[PDB]
Structure 1
Amino acid sequence: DRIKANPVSEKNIDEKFIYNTADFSIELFKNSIDDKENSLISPLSAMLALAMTANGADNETLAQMEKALGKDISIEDLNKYLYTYMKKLPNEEKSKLTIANSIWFKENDFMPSKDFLQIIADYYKADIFKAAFDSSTVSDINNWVKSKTNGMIDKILNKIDPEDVMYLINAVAFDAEWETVYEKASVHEDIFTDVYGNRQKVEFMNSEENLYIEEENAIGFVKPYAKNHYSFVAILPDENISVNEYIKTLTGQKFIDLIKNAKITLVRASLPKFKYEYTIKMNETLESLGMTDAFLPDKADFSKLGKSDIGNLYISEVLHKTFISVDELGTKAGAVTSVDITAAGIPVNFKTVKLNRPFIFAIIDNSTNLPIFIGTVLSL
């Protein structure tokens, strides 16, 4: 409306972005997973929401965020890279991917920096909303994410704290068909009882696949979506190692390369059918990547976002909500990352450790091998 997006230069996607963003993605993953059997993160979604927020950070808060997201990529080069990456990611019938960004800020106690709002509009194509931050803003925001995730996630907020001044929000929506769908005759329902004694029913889908992943600590396959822009990666870690041991061996470059080195050979693949929602408060996960100052009211420097009259601004939470449905016809997947900028108080977080062996999966962009989504199902 007022802030008018200006033309910007592209920065061609290259080995540096691919491998650095791979590094962030896998590290985000291995510090995200917990006791939850079903989990799902979108490193892309969190990347974008956090890249937007980094543009308001200064000094040590900035330096920690640049390092956590881009390693050695400056926020300026990250701005160019992500703009380019959003621009060129394929999106068409049977192979849909959309990405949306928004900034919501308080009309009252907060004056945003004109330069911050501009750089966001320029590189992130963000919707900018000046708001009251009352109950109606809650419905406004949930309307936005419901729309931008195609109904996969209809709510991100339920209430706004009186000392909140800004929400930086990214949404992602993925809707694609398999290149080769499953006939129902390829699907078979097995009944079992879980660890806790509960009857579970999992439908398994059988296919012949032609990309076979073979690491020293894992087996897997890659199944393409129609139009060949995106694939589904499935990884079965070994039993001859600890679950904590396997996660620790995993790296960004290894993940890129293991898909790259997938041998063209026939593989009888079994893919579980699954549909779930997942929520993770990403505070502790991001602190463990070296982003610590942003979450500490006495330390955070977010003075590039703008002027506050209510106190020192800091991130109270990075909320990450996801949804996925893998069935016979394809995959629907949605993600929201909201970053909450507030004046007062202090977050309190608990974190659980993963103890069970997971069936690992990822939805990957075929031209980079970067995981748009990465998650876990089942207890092997």
Structure 2
Amino acid sequence: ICTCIYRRRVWELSKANSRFATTFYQHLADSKNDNDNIFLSPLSISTAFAMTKLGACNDTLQQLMEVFKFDTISEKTSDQIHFFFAKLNCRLYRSSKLVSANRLFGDKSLTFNETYQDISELVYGAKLQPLDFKENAEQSRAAINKWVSNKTEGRITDVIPSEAINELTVLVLVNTIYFKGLWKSKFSPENTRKELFYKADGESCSASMMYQEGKFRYRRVAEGTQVLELPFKGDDITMVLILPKPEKSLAKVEKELTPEVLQEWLDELEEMMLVVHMPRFRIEDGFSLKEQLQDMGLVDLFSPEKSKLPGIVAEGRDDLYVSDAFHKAFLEVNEEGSEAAASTAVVIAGRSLNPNRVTFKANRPFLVFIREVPLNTIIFMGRVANPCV
């Protein structure tokens, strides 16, 4: 945009968004078997719900502000949050594509308040779309899924699974962020070799390991955890990997992740000339945020008995509540970046490199982050626990 209440601005909100991001990851991770891959965008989640908060009141509002940690932005009122999001968004959605598919669908004569409509449209770029859930749920589901697959250029198709929508749904929320980007320092396909990945428990399996030597921001911190930042073409988006000393389990790294120690690691990285080895991997993960969030304190927005949602009116039957909330994420990373494999081979001539150069061999499970650096905003988060094919 660039030009009911509870209680630079971009730096404050990025911090809030990061604390939620860590906590939601730690919970989601806690819920899972270690050999499972995780990948999700906290920013679409915090953004989708900050857009939804626009219509809530009384206690619903009060806890949205609290679950997503926006209440950490001291001396600010809930309305102020949407200005901060307006700023953050302007900047974010200016060889790095960031496409945000985000929407609130609903209809059984659900009329959104004029201003809800307008601020969602202005600050979040969302449309609050009337969809006939009542008479034709299957076409409604199909329609939603088609809208997302259009926004995400064909990747992320089955957002809304099947049964989750039917002639009883009121409002459903769907969000994702799509990123397509090329590596700053591409790997050459001629040095992609099958090697052994050593799983969280036990199994050795074959991943296609990529290799390159280059200058990257790296540091080896406490308990031998190596942090490494690889960048995309155009130095504002980077991928940060975290690989623990093989004695220490990643699981433990997850458990001790404060956003504060995450930052502390970033400040300890320096440009350094090293040898990189990391698998090519595809991670796709999608889910209903609803149970996860409920368990974290977001109860009232989903309860027909408790949802204070002034923003939306229905003729007579006012017990409007968020029936479901879905989120999917897809990452396919290879030698070129997060985009189409083209056979760009690489020839480096005239480089004699020091022995006793540090090696980075992510051949055992590691965390992944996709960080927007100027804004310091975590766009994606994950754990490549098994890239075997």
Whole-angstrom CA distance in 2 between matches of 1:238 and 1:290: 35
Opposite residue 14 of structure 2, the aligned amino acid is I
Give the secondary structure class of the aligned counterpart of 1:150. coil
Q: Which residue of 1 aligns with 2:43?
A: 44
Opposite residue 16 of structure 1, the aligned amino acid is E
Whole-angstrom CA distance in 2 between matches of 1:193 and 1:227: 33
2:172 to 158, 167, 170: 167
Per the TM alignment, residue 274 of structure 1 is displaced from its structure 2 partner at its CA by 0.4
1:27 to 20, 23, 32: 23
Give the secondary structure class of the aligned counterpart of 1:151. coil
> Structure 1 residues 238 and 174, CA, compared in 2 at 3 Å: closer, same or farther?
same
Q: Which residue of 2 aligns with 1:324?
A: 331
Aligned 8 A contact 1:221 1:269 in 2:
no
Per the TM alignment, residue 215 of structure 1 is displaced from its structure 2 partner at its CA by 3.0
Matched, 1:298 2:305: yes
Percent pairwise identity: 24
> Structure 1 residues 297 and 130, CA, compared in 2 at 3 Å: closer, same or farther?
closer
> Structure 1 residues 242 and 210, CA, compared in 2 at 3 Å: closer, same or farther?
closer
Give the secondary structure class of the aligned counterpart of 2:170. strand
> Structure 1 residues 377 and 114, CA, compared in 2 at 3 Å: closer, same or farther?
same
Q: Which residue of 2 aligns with 1:277?
A: 284
Q: Which residue of 1 aligns with 2:191?
A: 186
Q: Give ranges in structure 2 of 5+ residues lacking alignment.
A: 341-363
Whole-angstrom CA distance in 2 between matches of 1:8 and 1:305: 28
Whole-angstrom CA distance in 1 between matches of 2:383 and 2:90: 29
Aligned 8 A contact 1:8 1:122 in 2:
no
Whole-angstrom CA distance in 2 between matches of 1:366 and 1:272: 24
2:154 to 151, 156, 163: 151
Whole-angstrom CA distance in 1 between matches of 2:19 and 2:50: 15
Whole-angstrom CA distance in 2 between matches of 1:127 and 1:41: 23
The TM-score with structure 1 as length reference comes to 0.81
Work out which of the two has the higher radius of gyration on C-alpha atoms and give 1 or 2: 2
Q: Which residue of 2 aligns with 1:362?
A: 369
Per the TM alignment, residue 262 of structure 1 is displaced from its structure 2 partner at its CA by 1.2
Whole-angstrom CA distance in 2 between matches of 1:167 and 1:17: 26
**Higher mean C-alpha deviation, range 232-241 or range 218-227:** 232-241
Could you give the per-residue CA deviations for residues 168-202 of structure 1, whole angstroms, max 9, x where no partner exists? 33332101100111012332112568679988421
Give the secondary structure class of the aligned counterpart of 1:131. coil
Q: Which residue of 1 aligns with 2:218?
A: 212
Per the TM alignment, residue 139 of structure 1 is displaced from its structure 2 partner at its CA by 2.1
Give the secondary structure class of the aligned counterpart of 2:26. helix
Matched, 1:76 2:79: yes
Give the secondary structure class of the aligned counterpart of 2:234. helix
Give the secondary structure class of the aligned counterpart of 2:332. strand
Per the TM alignment, residue 376 of structure 1 is displaced from its structure 2 partner at its CA by 0.8
Opposite residue 335 of structure 2, the aligned amino acid is E
Opposite residue 170 of structure 1, the aligned amino acid is N
Whole-angstrom CA distance in 1 between matches of 2:293 and 2:329: 17
Opposite residue 81 of structure 2, the aligned amino acid is L
Matched, 1:117 2:100: no
Could you give the per-residue CA deviations for residues 282-302 of structure 1, whole angstroms, max 9, x where no partner exists? 234323443232233333322
1:15 to 8, 11, 15: 11
Aligned 8 A contact 2:368 2:383 in 1:
yes
Match runs of 1:214-253 below 5 Å? 214-217=220-223, 218-241=225-248, 243-253=250-260
Q: How many residues align?
A: 346
Per the TM alignment, residue 233 of structure 1 is displaced from its structure 2 partner at its CA by 0.6
